[PDB]
Design a protein around this ligand. Sequence first.
Ligand SMILES: CCCCCCCCCCCCCCCCCC(=O)O[C@@H](COC(=O)CCCCCCCCCCCCCCC)COP(=O)(O)OCC[N+](C)(C)C
Ligand SMILES: CCCCCCCCCCCCCCCCCCCC(=O)O[C@H](COC(=O)CCCCCCCCCCCCCC)COP(=O)(O)OCCN
Lengths: 57, 100, 77, 324, 488, 92, 88, 138, 58, 62, 64, 40
Amino acid sequence: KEISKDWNTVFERSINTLFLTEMVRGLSLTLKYFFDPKVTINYPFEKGPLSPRFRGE
Amino acid sequence: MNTDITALEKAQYPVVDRNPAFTKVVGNFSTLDYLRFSTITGISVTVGYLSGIKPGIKGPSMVTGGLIGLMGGFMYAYQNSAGRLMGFFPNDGEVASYQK
Amino acid sequence: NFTLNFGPQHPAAHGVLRLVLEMNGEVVERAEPHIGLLHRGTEKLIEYKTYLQALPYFDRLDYVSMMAQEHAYSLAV
Amino acid sequence: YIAVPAEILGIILPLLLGVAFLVLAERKVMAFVQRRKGPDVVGSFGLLQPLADGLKLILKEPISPSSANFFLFRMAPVATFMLSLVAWAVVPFDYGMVLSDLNIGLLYLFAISSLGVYGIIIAGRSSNSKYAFLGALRSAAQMVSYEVSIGLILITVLICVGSCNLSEIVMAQKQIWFGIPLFPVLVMFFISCLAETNRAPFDLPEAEAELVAGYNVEYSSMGFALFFLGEYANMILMSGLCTLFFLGGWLPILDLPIFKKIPGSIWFSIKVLFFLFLYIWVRAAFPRYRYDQLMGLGWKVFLPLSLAWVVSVSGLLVTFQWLP
Amino acid sequence: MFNLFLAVFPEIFIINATFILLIHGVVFSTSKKYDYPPLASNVGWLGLLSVLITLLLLAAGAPLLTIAHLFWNNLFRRDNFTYFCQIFLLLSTAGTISMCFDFFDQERFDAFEFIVLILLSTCGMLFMISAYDLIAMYLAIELQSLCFYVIAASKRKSEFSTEAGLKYLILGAFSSGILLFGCSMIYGSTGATHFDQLAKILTGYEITGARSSGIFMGILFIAVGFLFKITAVPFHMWAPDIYEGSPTPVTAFLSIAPKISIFANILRVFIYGSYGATLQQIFFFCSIASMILGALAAMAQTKVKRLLAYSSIGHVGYICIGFSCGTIEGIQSLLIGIFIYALMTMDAFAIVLALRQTRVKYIADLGALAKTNPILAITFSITMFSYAGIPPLAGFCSKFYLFFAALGCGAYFLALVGVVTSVIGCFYYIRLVKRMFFDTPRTWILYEPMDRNKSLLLAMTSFFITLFLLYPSPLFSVTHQMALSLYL
Amino acid sequence: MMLEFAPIFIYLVISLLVSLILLGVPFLFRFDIRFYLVSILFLIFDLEVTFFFPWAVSLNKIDLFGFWSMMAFLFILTIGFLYEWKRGALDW
Amino acid sequence: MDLIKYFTFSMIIFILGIWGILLNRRNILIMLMSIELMLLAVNLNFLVFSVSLDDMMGQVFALLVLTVAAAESAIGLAIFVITFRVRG
Amino acid sequence: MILSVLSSLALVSGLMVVRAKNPVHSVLFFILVFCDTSGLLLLLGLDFFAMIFLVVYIGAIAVLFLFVVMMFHIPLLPTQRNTTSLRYTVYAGKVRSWTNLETLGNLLYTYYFVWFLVSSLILLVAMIGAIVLTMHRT
Amino acid sequence: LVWLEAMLPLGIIGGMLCIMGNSQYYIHKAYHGRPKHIGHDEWDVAMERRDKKVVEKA
Amino acid sequence: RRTILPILQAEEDERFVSEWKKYLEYEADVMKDVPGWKVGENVYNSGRWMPPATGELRPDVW
Amino acid sequence: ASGWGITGNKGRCYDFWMDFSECMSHCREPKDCTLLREDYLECLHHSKEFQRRNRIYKEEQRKL
Amino acid sequence: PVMEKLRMFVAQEPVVAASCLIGGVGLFLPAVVRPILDSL
Ligand SMILES: CCCCCCCCCCCCCCCCCC(=O)O[C@@H](COC(=O)CCCCCCCCCCCCCCC)COP(=O)(O)OCC[N+](C)(C)C
Ligand SMILES: CCCCCCCCCCCCCCCCCCCC(=O)O[C@H](COC(=O)CCCCCCCCCCCCCC)COP(=O)(O)OCCN
């Protein structure tokens, strides 16, 4: 019988599941990366790093 | 709203407070009104208990019957008290209470 | 009951996945995967190559954990 | 009385190009959220990418056997597209920037939104497939279910303003937006508009419709694209409805008589694009939502709660004699 | 403010009790603690108690229920006629719901929605009697109509119940559309939806002096819709099939509870909204046809429910005789006939439900019933004779006074057709008698004993039927007061 | 006061024409009850919206009487929806 | 003369609904559409009469008729799907 | 002339409803009948009912029918030479002129409020009936 | 700084949304000579008709 | 709006009486035969006057 | 008859109906003031005025 | 007492409890607060 029956904690849980606190917290994380610098490279002009041991032609 | 409480067939008996407020007619309940309220509620509770033994719900049926009986008895007592004040009923008590 | 089949080409199902499953209209009752679409034949090919020539087959088995299979082959040897 | 068609074209053509650039914005914003660039090579900043997409779609063979009565399949895109456009004939952009001035214009919007269900239904039925039709039907049921929440929230808004006219609704928000008091109602309306266009975590109905079938039906080259255009036009419309009702339609947001150079026509557009950005953000911030729990959610957390909000707003306004 | 609702307590209470019963049933039919209990008999007993309580509320408010009559004028107008009609309809509903309790547990039909729908249709009927306007009339008709459409197809295993429910649905929808189209033009040609002002714009000028093609044809369509509602010949397209297919308790509630309210409604419409004297003709021919065809068709039926259906049609014709002769005595005979027919129908359906315990289907199964259960055989024979109109019983008095009313207005053809239809009608009733006393079949069907509520109701009705002629004054006086209360 | 619907009609005709010219460019080059149930609930809770629409607009004119009548209507439909909820027919 | 045209159009819709419900005894689906057509024709009768007389009792009752129409359609299709479950 | 063509098209659609070949096209013409009817009401001057006809008839009833069909498979003479100029307009009453919605709601919930509750009871009957019959839940 | 590329399509769609309204406003003003009134009631249309008639007479 | 209508109502009355006398002289002009025509009379037996009816229901919306 | 107008002011035929009803309220025979009933009925439909205009148009037509 | 069952119900059903609370507020304001401010 999983119980969380306490007057104060029922209010605290019933607000988080009603005002989407988890959703807002997971939503504000993407906005942090929206303004962050990107990690891509324009391939034809800039090449990705390699190693002296690379296996090619 | 425009409300006019005028019966088609006028009261044959003396009228007191032709438009009685809810609180006063609730406070006008005589011993007969309380007795009929009590007997209606008791009959309803007994029927609720007796009927709800085959399904097994013995207490919830009691509560449902009690609610129904309380509502019905209160409506009946209120109707009798109002008709007494409105003058439709014999109302020999509060006609004397009005004088004093 | 109808028996529709999978095989989506986008990498949702990791590709090369064929799934013939019977449902009860909305609820699936039995799913029978049809493996073999990627049976290259490594087990038969290993027998034809030296213990060193057969090492890179183990990179091509579980191609997200390449050094995990090489570990097992090296430990066996 | 010959001036109307010019206005009609001036409303239609920018809508189509805005839909194209909204697709571009979707791609670009999802790229930026995931630390990418998105379409950058074509044009200057990807601005010519939708044009290349359109010219590529036109320059392809059309797969149009239609394997059916040849009529119902070509009328569903027409119906959904004409509905998603005629819903735009009542929007009060700034003050006279409105095509039609319906004295109701809100029950009209509700009716137009409700009528936009037959298009997908007859698309699924005409498309002779044993799962595409079923998926279209589930999507229709989802839109139908969230229509009642949309309507209750519209009633909540209409109680405060007191008149159905859309222009008067914005006119009534001189004091405050209606978004400050009705913020839970604003969230509910956003979620309902998000779930009623299959453009959300509330998306799975159509998502599985292609996963298990691959759209092995009569897929016209760009005749199918009218569904996509109508869906994105509905996106824009239901993005603008939120800033008509809960935000100030064209009124300045927080402004002293200093930033009066700019007109009210762009105060509306900035809020519309903010809500579109929120749409894209919500899509690329949350996982998809199953249809089993989609229906249960839409029926058991929105109808009773929106009804309670209607009751509370009506009771509070009546008690203190604050009615219009 | 609140005291203006003293005239609606007999209805507000029944609505509140209906809601409470629905809530209790839905809450406690899905409880895992009690393992999904079969609370149909519980809900039925609570509903019977609620009906008794609202009957007590209605009976003791005779000086009341006429207060604030100006405020309620646009909605309804209740008076002495309405008071007695409601107080009798509610008693009939109580008896019907009481005699069907064993049906819930004998064949394991624990659906409490049946009882709540009975209660809510009864509330609709209570609205209908008080209804004093076309809009309220139509809405109160539609309440019971939809309740019965739902209830008829409740038993979803038998092809009879579903098909009969669908036929009832289609016929009732067509009748409602016809009636509503009739009311639409009467509104169009005069305005004045209210009955009080409809009886005043039509009394001014007779239809003979000048012809109004709108009011006449609207009245005709209203009459046609109402005759569809009571299933009066020739508007009897599927009524025997409805009564045969529908479950026995449903048919018990039908043909008593609906017909009383619809006949009160027709009285209110006929007395006020009809001054062209054109409804005499439509009632005349249709009642004659009902009489003749019921008498000639019930003799050819071999099942029981079909026979009761055609007997109901015949008695509807007998009662409709009272509409053709518009006088105080005509309405008195009509109401007395309705009362007696209601009692006899309750008794007959109690008989049918009693033998339903062993699935009685035809008329030959009740063979040699005087041996297994002689007293039930005597009761059934007495009820059948009361249907026949034999003098030393109730049912003869109703036919007697209906004939008196018919002869009072000079409709001498109505009396003759009534006599001949009675002569043929008694024949197949006695035919039912022979197979149940005299001839003994080789194979005997054994019926398990009855329960106390049905037996008590049956005994009360049987003693009422036999001993009615000893002391019939109260019914006659009630009916004379009711007939005069339509005007004063 | 109602001439503002002819613009809607002309807009609809022009939108249909635009749809036709859009579709013509390349040319110039089994049973579930739950669906019925959700449809019924939508119908029932759409009639209540059609009833709400006159109530909200004219709510100022009517004080403490129209509000309570609409509250009684809402209570009746709430009892209906509560019976709907417990019986099932509302989840999948 | 437009009241005459309105009334004749509504009456023809009414008789056409009667025509539809009378002919096909077995479709059970066209019957419901014909019933809806009858209700529609009567609603137009009431609304047109209300407009002509400048009286409001026509539009109130016309609006109330929609509840009956919707309830009848819902119950009709419920009974229809119950009936269809037996056969096929 | 707008009334004539609209009425004729509505009549044709209604005729084709009852003589249709398949239920799908019958429902499709059934929708067009209400579309034309709503247009006719809009011409009549009642905008509110004209849009309720979309919301209810072809918004919920038509959708319901389509869902079920998918599965389970003396006049004044036209002479008007001297009547378009004999229109007397009473300007009093044009000031503070209510719409079709305010007027209806003024007396729907206040004076004739019993019939409103009767319609609510009708809706409840429909809601209960649709459940009791069709809950298989197997 | 760097996120302006994502805001360019938003700016394009917003600008075309504002010219959406401005186009019909400028077209209606060009021929009618006035912007459109928010509330057209029977009284307002009555004065519009009477104003048109009196202007025509004058 | 309630302090503006008496002049608008006055000019409407002027226009209507002009049109009404024109129509009355037109009606008296056509009907010189068939004796028994009382030209223009109140069809209302009570004597109360109402505007001349037109066979156009709801004309003030288009 | 009811007195609730469409525009929200009053039924145009409500005053005539009330005059007729008030006359009938103290007139035990309907024939004495059937004139008011006729006035109310033809106020609803404008039958007599339309008949008169039809006669005028007939006088126009007979000149052919 | 009823408090334990009520609190357990609120814990399990947040949306229903919140809807009931807001509806109770919206029904309590015009039935209790309105008469007492009417009499000033
Ligand atoms: C207030 C407005 C109306 C609110 C209700 C409207 C909606 C209608 C709902 C009606 C149905 C409600 C029924 C549930 C109510 C709570 C049920 C209950 O109290 O019973 C409890 C407990 O109840 C009791 O024990 C005592 C309650 C009955 C005693 C009081 C009778 C009622 C007297 C009058 C009614 C109250 C006054 C009127 C209202 C103020 C359970 O007991 P059992 O489980 O049966 O006992 C154990 C069973 N077993 C042995 C098998 C394990
Ligand atoms: C600044 C301008 C911004 C404009 C845009 C508005 C903000 C939009 C932000 C959206 C971000 C999140 C979007 C996610 C979309 C999908 C999320 C849906 C999840 C969901 O529905 O959860 C439900 C609760 O939601 C809800 O309940 C939501 C409704 C909120 C209810 C009101 C909450 C406080 C009420 C207090 C009232 C105070 C006034 C009283 C007088 C229940 O979730 P569950 O499934 O776990 O539940 C168990 C029951 N089966």
